[PDB]
């Protein structure tokens, strides 16, 4: 949360990535993972299967 | 220098228990019949 400087540097010369671990998301295929051993969760999810006529 | 880590396996079904076919092998059956017997006032049927 704070403004940073360097002074002699172009912003080719610089990859700077956001942070954030308040919440969890979803185990998508198309996001790549945080650590290897990939600790996880689970939330339960609606609509289950049911008999009708 | 960047490596990629793919990784896929298979699981049963989430309702496999709601819908799936069973494999069996069938043996000697048993008869099992139901008979209506009818002589003079009685009037019954037993399960055999
Ligand atoms: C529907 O009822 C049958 C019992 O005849 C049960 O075995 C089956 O699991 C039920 N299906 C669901 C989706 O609850
Ligand atoms: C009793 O026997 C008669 C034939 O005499 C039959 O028509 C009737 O169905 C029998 N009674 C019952 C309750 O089934």
């Given at each position: 949360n704070s403004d940073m400087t360097i002074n002699?540097?172009?912003?080719?010369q610089c990859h700077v990535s956001v942070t954030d671990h308040k919440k969890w998301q979803f185990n998508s295929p198309f996001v790549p993972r945080?650590?290897?051993?990939?600790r996880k969760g689970k939330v339960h999810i609606p609509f289950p299967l049911d008999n009708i006529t | 220098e960047n490596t990629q880590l793919s990784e896929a396996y298979v699981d049963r079904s989430d309702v496999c228990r709601h819908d799936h076919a069973s494999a069996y092998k069938a043996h000697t059956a048993s008869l099992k019949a139901k008979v209506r017997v009818m002589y003079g006032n009685v009037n019954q049927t037993v399960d055999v």
């Open positions: 002699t540097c172009l912003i080719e945080a650590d290897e051993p990939a | -």
